[PDB]
């Protein structure tokens, strides 16, 4: 509504760098279409998980499969307000697809906003639309951007972002917060009431998407967001799980990106936060056995403060006993816990639908992030206005 | 034969939690039917390898594909003497399948024996059949059971087992030995002659099933089982291999569960054992180059004591020269090893058929575990009797 | 022409043990046919990546799919001058395939050369064609050869090779250089003018084939070859990447073999070395950012010395500005870097062809190694003559 954005997808694009923008932009009220040359709506793109394990370069792994919702060569550029270019290993080959470069050129002339991250810039270079343009990218793309005539801004840190009129660029997904806020501002958006402090309850093997997307999305808004995990210091990292359906009766499990806690668990002053968020995956099942974690949940529910849990997150809510006489949804399987917890089941159909019950927001699976964050914003007083 | 048990399978059930009971029980003269809702006999289910590597929860990878030998919608519960519920991530979604809960309800009413392990209990909680019943499960399931009115027994160790009449529960597959024996006694079985000490010759990359299945089946019988490996002590652990036939000309390989040795290899004495078991996999080929390992094999052989090796295990035997003028079978490829070793080949058809020559029991692949353990029991004079 | 060789392939053969000879022999003017029982030209076999990681035996991983260029049951064994038998897990089941054992025996009967490595020797043992023959193989294949009546040579080190008239044998791929040379001489081939020092610019996640095949082909030729990596000692190792197309719009990625460096990067002296080789994969993009790396490339190019780059290696040339007014090809996607670098693009069609622009040799991908090496050989004046 009011704004429509087009994301340029491709095989092996960085998981994070495609889903975070796809869902955040939606949670803010922007329609988003995803396309990939030679593919139609409903088709799938494999994705890459780029991370660092102590080598001179990043290590790669397979992320979730990403389904396109729009068809390439059937898109009317005139009908889009902005364009986003994901990173990973897709730009490398997309940057050499005639129809892709023609598209980025055409859009580039309209003067409309273009947000490119990591290796995405390579496409910009091929289209030769960066001359004299200030900009940044993954350190490795610098030679190509300088040779393209760009005003290269070396990324001293993974988070640095750069703007030059309608050209927004980022080095890595660590800069998603600012990357996204700028593309929003660039779309004529205004964010209000975003001066909140949210606490995320994390743990080992939490769902990759279910942590990153909600987390960064809330950061792009401007909130101060912290994440903790029992027995871990503000530097520790948590391994994540990538849950996806690949044909069998239940989802499959694969290693995702490594997540970094921001605060120490022991030094946690719950009263200082305006909200609490619980990611799903396999972490909730063991976090729910933790006394300290439960008390934290109790405090937020007692204070009638906003609480947003997704997927298996509700397992911690049911164990806190805070679901009694409460309406909510969860991952289809954890309906067991909701009922046993004393809550009233809300059918999660479609799977992307989330529900609000007073101070309680719940989601079923990662496909519900748009409504998930959107409804947590409402309980927070955060709005995003355009036109 | 005399009893018939039913195993409730599902996609991503714990590989060990299904294969060990499925094969140990057959080894004890019990017919076992495997079924999964929405699937027929001959279909397969992917399994999960749940293990620990230091994180706050278990790690997960894909195990062997498990082929069901029964059909769900064609089952008559009035024909089974018992029911086994394996763990993994299957209980989670099976618990929310109306037909599954109905089967547990009815089996629950008949009062016949029900053995549930790890996450399996979640199904019992769903069917509301644990009210006032003592029982245990993976610590994580504790909450759900309590809310289902169960008398919860927290697992202080990974092998704790509970029994409240016809209900038998275990926390992890590390409790299989007692889990199975209790299930057998509940079916009215009596085990006699299990006053034996057995020695296992392990090594890195031995087959996953080919170690745990025989090792745990023997323990469930009551035997004392020791496992060793050159240059490794009691606490040490060996990486295992998961060999499975996918669509190629030979089997593929994946990591299996890590296996824990029980005794220091140097502190051994062939004297104190009544039989020697040799797992297959890739451990044999290099184990067969070890002096000490060969002497151990020789001692057991000329002492005429019972010796059982499956799959590639027969390589150690050939290298020890103890297959001189003897009949035996092995993984098809190891026929060269048997012949060049001076043995007479026995066609491994069907793949689950094992052969006993004098004091020597041999099998082809892991599917022959039932006949393998059965035949080893026969040389040890161990028996299981019902009715 | 002059010589034609047949290579016995099989599912799960060692990836290196097939590509290195398959390609190195073609770069030496020898026609090579790959064949696998029950498979026809155009079919493919999965390969296996073997090497140690701190365990008692090797670890296995999946390597590149290998497509056969000939049909087994259509081979006129009479028109072949030599036979190569790769290792890995394939021999194990091939040794038990009648057609295969007869082919081998029929070939050992003609006196013609037979090069076998690692586990390949098991096939010779099955054919009983090694009596009183001096030879070596992978340590665990010794007991079999001894029993087949061979004069076993324990591989004191992994790089040992043994020649006994027409039977050339090696223990591991580490001995490929000597292995290939001996086979070539035994084919009546002479190598002249190979006294050259060659430098390889290596890094983390370079294409597995792209470093090993060219590296070892030049070593077999007699050249002294060094491998370096920024800030890494002679003992350090580099992880590699296996890039392969599996159906998506761009290649996929798996871990390959670890590659050890030969000299220290800091003590490197560009003065020596007659040529420079730059492997592809993901290492270039980050090496292209290293000042030191660009100087080395600078030096060579100024000296007019032969420079050979393949796949993504050109990203380093382009960055050093040495493509200015040079004609060359590269991996399709990296055309961007070639054009931005001021070079004239040479279309890599067919994918396996390379080009020579003065002192510059460039290839598109690993499928082009044959022309890649023969063209570097031409600049260096190295020749292989037969008849």
Curated annotation (Swiss-Prot), chains A, B, C:
Q: What is its EC number?
A: 4.4.1.5
Enzyme class, one word? lyase
Query: What keywords were assigned to this record?
Result: Lyase, Oxidation, Repeat, Stress response
Q: Per the UniProt annotation, how does pH influence activity?
A: Optimum pH is 6.8.
Q: What is the effect of changing residue 210 to A?
A: Reduces catalytic activity 2-fold. Almost abolishes catalytic activity
Thermal behavior of activity: Optimum temperature is 45 degrees Celsius.
Asked whether the keyword Transferase is assigned, the reply is no
The record's annotation in Gene3D superfamilies points to: 3.40.50.880
Q: Which Pfam families match?
A: DJ-1_PfpI
Record has Repeat as a keyword: yes
Write down the chemical reaction(s) this protein catalyses: (R)-S-lactoylglutathione = methylglyoxal + glutathione
What about PTM? Cys-118 and Cys-311 are oxidized to sulfinic acid.
Assembly and interactions?
Homotrimer.
The record's section on NCBIfam families has: PfpI
User: What family does this belong to?
Assistant: Belongs to the peptidase C56 family.
Q: What is this protein called?
A: Protein DJ-1 homolog D
């Amino acid at each position: 509504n009011s704004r429509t954005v087009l994301i340029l997808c491709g095989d092996y694009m960085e998981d994070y760098e495609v889903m975070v923008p796809f869902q955040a932009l939606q949670a803010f009220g922007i329609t988003v279409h995803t396309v990939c040359p030679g593919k139609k709506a409903g088709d799938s793109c494999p994705t890459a998980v780029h991370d660092f394990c102590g080598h001179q370069t990043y290590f790669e792994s397979r992320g979730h499969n990403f389904t396109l919702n729009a068809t390439f060569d059937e898109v009317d550029l005139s009908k889009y307000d902005g364009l986003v270019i994901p990173g990973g290993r897709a730009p490398e080959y997309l940057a050499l697809t005639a129809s892709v470069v023609e598209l980025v050129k055409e859009f580039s002339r309209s003067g409309k906003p273009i947000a490119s991250i990591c290796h995405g810039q390579l496409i910009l270079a091929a289209a030769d639309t960066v001359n004299g343009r200030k900009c940044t990218a993954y350190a490795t793309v610098g030679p190509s951007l300088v040779a393209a005539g760009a005003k290269w801004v070396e990324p001293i840190t993974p988070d640095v972002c750069v703007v030059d009129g309608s050209l927004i660029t980022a080095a890595t997904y660590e800069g998603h917060p600012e990357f996204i806020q700028l593309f929003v501002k660039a779309l004529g958006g205004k964010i209000t009431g975003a001066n909140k402090r949210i606490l995320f309850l994390c743990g080992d093997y939490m769902e990759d998407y279910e942590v990153k997307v909600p987390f960064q999305s809330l950061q792009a808004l401007g909130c101060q967001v912290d994440a903790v995990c029992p027995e871990k210091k503000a530097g520790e990292r948590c391994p994540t799980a990538i849950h996806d359906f690949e044909g069998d009766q239940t989802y499959s499990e694969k290693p995702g990106h490594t997540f970094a806690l921001t605060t120490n668990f022991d030094d946690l002053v719950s009263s200082s936060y305006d909200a609490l968020v619980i990611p799903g995956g396999r972490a909730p099942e063991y976090l729910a056995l933790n006394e300290h974690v439960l008390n934290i949940v109790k405090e937020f529910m007692n204070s009638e403060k906003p609480v947003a849990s997704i997927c298996h997150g509700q397992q911690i809510l049911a164990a806190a006993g805070v679901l009694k006489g409460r309406k909510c949804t969860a991952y289809p399987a954890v309906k067991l816990n909701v009922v046993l917890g004393g809550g009233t089941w809300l059918e999660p159909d479609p799977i992307d639908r989330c529900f609000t019950d007073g101070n309680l927001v719940t989601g079923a699976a990662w496909p519900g992030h748009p409504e998930f964050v959107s409804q947590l914003m409402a309980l927070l007083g955060i709005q995003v206005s355009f036109h």
